[PDB]
Amino acid sequence: PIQEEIQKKVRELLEKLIEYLEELKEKEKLEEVIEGLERLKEEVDQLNMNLIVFEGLEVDEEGRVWFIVKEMLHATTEEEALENMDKFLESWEKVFKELLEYHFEHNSPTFDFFLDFLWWQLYGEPM
């Protein structure tokens, strides 16, 4: 069904980040990130009507990272469901990029938070 195109669209960005992280390895934290993402890939083959979209990351007055939220993209209809999946994965890759760069600069549970939040927004459980 239409669900399938979404599942495929998931594994797409998944392998995108497989590529980026593997080329950047030249790094054990990078490998644990890679582990967790391929760990979640095997559950792909769900559609949530309400999707949280982050604009980016802002560091507070101290060494506390924050994920700034744009809005929740409530897709009324089906084509909007696909199109919110699109905007969502695009902003998610965006924040992921800023996140890797920040973690190598500043050198915290932020990354596993990011990963498990993807797991949550897709499969529906904390794990």
């Binding site: 949280i52 924050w66 929740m72 949550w120 927004q121 904390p126």
Partner: protein
């Protein structure tokens, strides 16, 4: 004491049932998110039509309990704990700034497509 994520998901609409029957609708929006903490702006609506405004700081403590601090435009503060009762309902228990205590059942609004009633027990 309940996993933090239980508060982000779903539609950002709820209803606060007070101890006496007063129902006040909550239209809220999460601005910032951390592994430990959460920030959100909240807009209440009384049954007569009065609105309010708040900024609420949610966080999980050391022992895993959910605690919150709410800031209002009346110079009034609120502080308390949030215990999840089911997937759509969590019970706030706490103390206002002048000292008066309270208990509030914050339920979330479920869409028409499905089972509205949610015991989930």
């Amino acid at each position: 004491g309940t996993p933090l994520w239980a508060l982000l998901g779903g539609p950002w609409r709820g209803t606060a049932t007070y101890e006496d029957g007063t129902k006040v609708t909550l239209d809220y929006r999460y601005t910032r998110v951390s592994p430990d903490r959460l920030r959100a702006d909240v807009t209440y609506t009384t049954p007569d039509g009065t609105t309010l405004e708040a900024t609420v700081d949610l966080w999980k403590d050391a022992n895993g309990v959910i605690r919150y601090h709410a800031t209002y435009p009346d110079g009034t503060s609120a502080d308390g704990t949030l215990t999840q009762l089911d997937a759509d309902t969590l019970l706030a228990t706490g103390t206002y700034d002048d000292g008066t205590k309270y208990t509030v059942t914050l339920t979330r609004v479920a869409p028409g497509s499905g089972w509205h009633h949610h015991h989930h027990h």
